[PDB]
């Protein structure tokens, strides 16, 4: 077995070998990538995604996030408080200010150390889950807007038809804004591209391991347990690499820089938090390898988690004994 120890590998495909996206995330694959979670995927030399970022200014950030935590520094929640909107131009001069900037430090391992020391304490803003592209239509190779769509990977693999579409997003971070620990939606593939700006570090459990996470987070969030059988699918809760130690939770990390793309992998739990000033692009896909993990995949039905209209098919094709349940929570 290819990568027994679940380590996050790190490839550096030849402009040759990134012509054919699904050949090479199938190459990764075999050589056991996916049993970490997560893997980093660096560009050839001759790639890029767009010709300058200088133009980006007037982009509008139309419900930023304040990430409010509540807990203690290794084991805490975070609601998003809306705020009023602002151009990223106006957000990277936000990120920028004294009271948000980074603080100075030594190295990536100093800053994770501030990061899980004084995030509490700290309501940082997220320009998170904007609808768009930066990525060049010219661009041919690993445009993450210009990949196959999920429903004709369905279509293909099971053989119906289903409404819904598959977009990127953005997002604009800043020093010790937050994702929460989260597999993405029916347990797909992520692919996020780091555009512009500070680094993004990363958590991943490996796959095989999920539940023991799934076991850690209903032991130490009780009440959130209580009220939802899949509470993690509401992305609010965190959980540090200290205390995944101390409950022997298997985990690996990584920082991504930018220019470099990183992939989660069906089932993948991942956490992270950025550097100071960034724009990520990601979006989901899927895998023929994929198919049986939607089909498994939890769900939240207590109406928290809330999602993507193209989420409904996903559910009412691979789980139907699930679809009534689910989609009343989704009213
Ligand atoms: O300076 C900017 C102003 C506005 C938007 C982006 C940037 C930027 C883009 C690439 C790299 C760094 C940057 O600060
Ligand atoms: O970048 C972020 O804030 C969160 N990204 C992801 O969870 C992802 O790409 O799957
Ligand atoms: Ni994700
Ligand atoms: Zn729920």
Not at 128 to 136: T, W
């Amino acid at each position: 077995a290819q990568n027994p120890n679940c380590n996050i590998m790190i490839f550096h495909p030849t402009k040759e070998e990134f012509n054919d996206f699904d050949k090479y995330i199938a190459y990764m694959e075999s050589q056991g990538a996916h049993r970490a979670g997560l893997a980093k995927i660096i560009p050839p030399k001759e790639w890029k995604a767009r010709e300058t970022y200088d133009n980006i200014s007037e982009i509008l950030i139309a419900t930023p996030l304040q990430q409010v935590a509540s807990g203690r520094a290794g084991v805490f929640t975070q609601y998003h408080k809306k705020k009023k909107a602002m151009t990223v131009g106006e957000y990277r001069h936000l990120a920028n200010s004294k009271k948000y900037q980074t603080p100075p430090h030594q190295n990536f391992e100093d800053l994770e150390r501030k990061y899980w020391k004084n995030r509490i304490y700290n309501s940082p803003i997220y320009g998170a889950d904007i609808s768009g592209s930066l990525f060049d239509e010219n661009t041919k190779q690993w445009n993450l807007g210009h990949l196959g769509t999920i429903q004709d990977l369905l279509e293909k693999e099971c053989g119906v038809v289903i409404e819904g579409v598959n977009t990127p997003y953005l997002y604009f971070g800043m020093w010790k804004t937050t994702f929460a620990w989260h597999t993405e939606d029916m347990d797909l593939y992520s692919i996020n591209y780091l555009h512009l700006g500070e680094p993004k570090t990363w958590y991943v459990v490996p796959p095989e391991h999920g539940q023991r996470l799934e076991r850690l987070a209903r032991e130490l969030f009780p009440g959130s347990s209580r009220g939802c059988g899949a509470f993690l699918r509401h992305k609010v809760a965190l959980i540090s690499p200290t205390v995944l130690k101390e409950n022997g939770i298997p985990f690996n990390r990584i920082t991504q820089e930018a220019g470099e793309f990183m992939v989660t992998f069906p089932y993948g739990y991942h956490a992270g938090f950025n550097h100071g000033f960034n724009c990520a692009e990601a979006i989901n896909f899927a895998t023929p390898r994929w198919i049986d993990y939607g089909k498994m995949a939890s769900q939240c039905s207590c109406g928290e988690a809330r999602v993507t209209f193209s989420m409904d098919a996903f559910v009412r094709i691979l789980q139907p004994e699930r679809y009534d349940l689910w989609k009343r929570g989704q009213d």
